[PDB]
Amino acid sequence: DLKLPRQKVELVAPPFVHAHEQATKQGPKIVEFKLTIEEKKVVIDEKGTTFQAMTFNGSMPGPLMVVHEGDYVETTLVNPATNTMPHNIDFHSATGALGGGALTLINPGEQVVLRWKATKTGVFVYHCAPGGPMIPWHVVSGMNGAVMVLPRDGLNDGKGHALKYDKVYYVGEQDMYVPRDEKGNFKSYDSPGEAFTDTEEMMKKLIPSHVVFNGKVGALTGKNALTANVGENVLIVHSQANRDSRPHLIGGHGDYVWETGKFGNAPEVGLETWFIRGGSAGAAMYKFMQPGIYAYVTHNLIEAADLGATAHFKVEGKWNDDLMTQVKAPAEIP
Amino acid sequence: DLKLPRQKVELVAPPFVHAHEQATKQGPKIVEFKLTIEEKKVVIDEKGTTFQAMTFNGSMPGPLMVVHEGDYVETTLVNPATNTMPHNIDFHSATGALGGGALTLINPGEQVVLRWKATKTGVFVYHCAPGGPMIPWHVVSGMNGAVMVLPRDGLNDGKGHALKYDKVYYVGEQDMYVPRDEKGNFKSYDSPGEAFTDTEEMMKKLIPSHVVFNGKVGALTGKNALTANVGENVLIVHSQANRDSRPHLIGGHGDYVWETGKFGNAPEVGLETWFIRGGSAGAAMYKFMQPGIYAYVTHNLIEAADLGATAHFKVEGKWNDDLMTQVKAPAEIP
Amino acid sequence: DLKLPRQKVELVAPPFVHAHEQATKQGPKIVEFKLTIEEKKVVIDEKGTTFQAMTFNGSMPGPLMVVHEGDYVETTLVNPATNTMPHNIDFHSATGALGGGALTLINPGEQVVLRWKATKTGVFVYHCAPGGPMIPWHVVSGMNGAVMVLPRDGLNDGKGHALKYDKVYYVGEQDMYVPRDEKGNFKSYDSPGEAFTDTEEMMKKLIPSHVVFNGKVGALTGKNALTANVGENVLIVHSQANRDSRPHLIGGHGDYVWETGKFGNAPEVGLETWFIRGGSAGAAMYKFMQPGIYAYVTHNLIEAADLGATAHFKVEGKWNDDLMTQVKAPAEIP
Ligand SMILES: OC[C@H]1O[C@@](CO)(O[C@H]2O[C@H](CO)[C@@H](O)[C@H](O)[C@H]2O)[C@@H](O)[C@@H]1O
Ligand SMILES: OC[C@H]1O[C@@](CO)(O[C@H]2O[C@H](CO)[C@@H](O)[C@H](O)[C@H]2O)[C@@H](O)[C@@H]1O
Ligand SMILES: OC[C@H]1O[C@@](CO)(O[C@H]2O[C@H](CO)[C@@H](O)[C@H](O)[C@H]2O)[C@@H](O)[C@@H]1O
Ligand SMILES: O=N[O-]
Ligand SMILES: O=N[O-]
Ligand SMILES: O=N[O-]
Ligand SMILES: O=N[O-]
Ligand SMILES: O=N[O-]
Ligand SMILES: O=N[O-]
């Protein structure tokens, strides 16, 4: 029935984002994506704690999907026989059928194809939601990502001016609930099913053991620091499918911020810290003015420094002494 | 002194809302309401857990009161002799005397009459606040509701256009603190006074045992699902008198949202999830586009699925395959 | 290199704010501040619980610094030899070097001088951030305050009209983590270092033992209540460097509120309760209409009434019976 051009996208692992246009002269298309679910035991911290993860495409978060307003998003969801549980997908960008969840429940060995029209602009969470108590469990096990639906004219500041990013990163934040044994050590489990009873008991107490970006403590640091140059405008998409977060770029700002994540609303300007409601994605852009290391955190600093929720940027360029200078280096008090 | 027409309102139990006009040609009136406090032991979950509730008019939340800007709200608060505690009422819509609390403290066997002028538009919490540590206790025992103060011209989108709802529902969310015994079972108590010591100890640890809509797990489901038809614009007022919430309509959106709840501010558009600050009411309107079941949740999914905070909508009408379609039903992977 | 006039400021302890202009005819200056770090054991509640505090200038919060857009803020940070730990300072208002933290690490016996240009308007947190797990620890030990960067034309409502406050107060909210012994009593420690292991274990569980304004339960009450008169427009700056808060003026409103705290954005109007994201400052102004006592709280009422987070205003003037009146005093039910 729907006679539009088809375009395939090759998804890439976070924090990177598949190539796309901001402003476009294309009209509506059917944009084709494939997500393959993977249940796997992973390491989540530098001490070697393990975790029974459930993922879209092998990553936490799932990859960022990018389309334009009025596109149709056609997703093939694949649940290989090597998995143990049923799964589905719910897109907060989509209208009807519990976001798609009611049309995409697949057992191991099955796949399904869902199409939805991208009628709402912004960044949006997608997540698994099989039913009942399985809903939180699959989400906090890692089965969540985001989609970005851009205006065809690209982003604007609300005030007729264009807002073009030089690069975009997707930071997915994951609250994790790893039980401890009597000794106080984190437990390991042989299967997601075996982790379930202890994990649910902990979940209901609402305090995570770990809060991480890109699936692990330190994931977005070292060789895998985010990067920029002085003068570059960087868009940072941040999602949290279950729990609030308060992003902050240490040493920078949010020049233009859509904390509720929806481009029909003008961005706020000049923020220190913004707020991502659990169950949402938001976005912030910043033009870097100074070189050096930045930390990108949730500004519950206990979560940031002690539970895992810190990324770094390494920024190249020339130091600006007008903006900041060390007038007198540390010295003995006179 | 005040020579205005008087109008009585017959309050109705949530989630329903007493009949009212949006835009009105009436001028200011004295609008008369009566609230009768009821302390009662209630069942809060499907397992039969009991709870020492304290309520306005017998319900959690208390009923929604609806007036227009510049009306005078005259409330008779009644504390029958069958109750055990003093109570009062604080309206966040009102100016002075701790919202009215300092003028409405009544012992069992007493009533009081308070009038306040509705100078601020929006949805607002009202709650009991007797003094000191009793304040949180009475609120988290159920003594809270909301009032809506509409502009005389009805609602608008900020952008000169009218926003008329076909129906309004009031979802009051309640964080509850039910202690457990050594065995791990929820405790039952013979009186609110007897529940107090254990309940306060738990309260101070800040983690609820239950988070419910309309006073009980599953209250707004089954026969008591909320309803709509495709094409209907529904306003959802959400309050939380003590703790944050993040509402989300699964399969829908917030087309126009006042998350801080105040109509002097333009609504935001096209939200996935919004945020109700503890101690406030907010409001979201959505025009339904697809039939079927929706879930309305707080998008801490642990709270939603495991602690009680899920409502349903059942929506009638014609499925829209342009907006969403199952291109290929579940099938074996090729 | 920088040839501008220099102006010294004498900082004053919170909740008060050093004298400053709103609108100004001055051009950019170098504004000179000195902060001297003090580690000290303090009493935090009316029961005599003690706490190993770490402070800027001896207070929790640190003092409010006020400048105008385009000023250069030159801070001498002093860490006397009587302290035990290294410290630094990070300004969320500043651009580069982790907000200044990477240029201001000083051992006991040292001082440092940092200058930053005030390119972003609003209220902003400043805090210590030595590195790693020390970051949260120093912040939740009290090492945080705020700076306000005003437009040179003063504040406006977004809608070309000026917003002039008659007085400003700074309310700094502190989440504190005091461990308990087996008996259930709060522990006391001989040094910050000795408090660290128990305090970190508690911190990671994310639930504070105390949430206070101005460093202690009841600090902003009694003789130290905030004050106003009917007709006065009061600006309330609220900061929280680590954890969310939801301010509310009981019996009043936020007439104009910048909850994200940044003056490049128009204020919202007529709020009941607003939201301060952990890691930020916000500001609300209210013109008092009624005399009497008000409470200023976070509207998690458990935190407010039971954990410490209540201030009072005592307001002088004439009661307005049009806005509110007790129509019938408490009486026996007919
Ligand atoms: O940034 C969105 C915000 O900007 C306004 C103008 O104040 O509208 C701009 O953005 C719309 C969505 O991209 C465009 O359709 C419109 O043409 C453009 O002016 C606001 O209406 C909107 O909330
Ligand atoms: O929706 C409120 C928002 O709309 C504006 C226009 O942008 O004002 C409209 O709403 C006011 C309150 O109902 C009316 O008094 C006004 O006439 C109407 O234009 C904004 O000023 C306001 O924040
Ligand atoms: O209150 C800030 C808000 O107001 C607007 C006008 O709607 O701009 C005013 O404030 C700016 C910052 O102080 C001034 O530069 C400007 O001249 C004045 O109109 C908005 O643009 C801004 O977001
Ligand atoms: O799943 N390991 O690459
Ligand atoms: O800005 N530091 O958390
Ligand atoms: O109070 N029972 O209907
Ligand atoms: O949209 N589901 O939580
Ligand atoms: O430090 N005592 O004043
Ligand atoms: O308005 N009282 O919390």
Ligand SMILES: [Cu+2]
């Ligand atoms: Cu799943």
Ligand SMILES: [Cu+2]
């Ligand atoms: Cu969801």
Ligand SMILES: [Cu+2]
């Ligand atoms: Cu009561």
Ligand SMILES: [Cu+2]
């Ligand atoms: Cu209140």
Ligand SMILES: [Cu+2]
């Ligand atoms: Cu320090």
Ligand SMILES: [Cu+2]
């Ligand atoms: Cu910070």
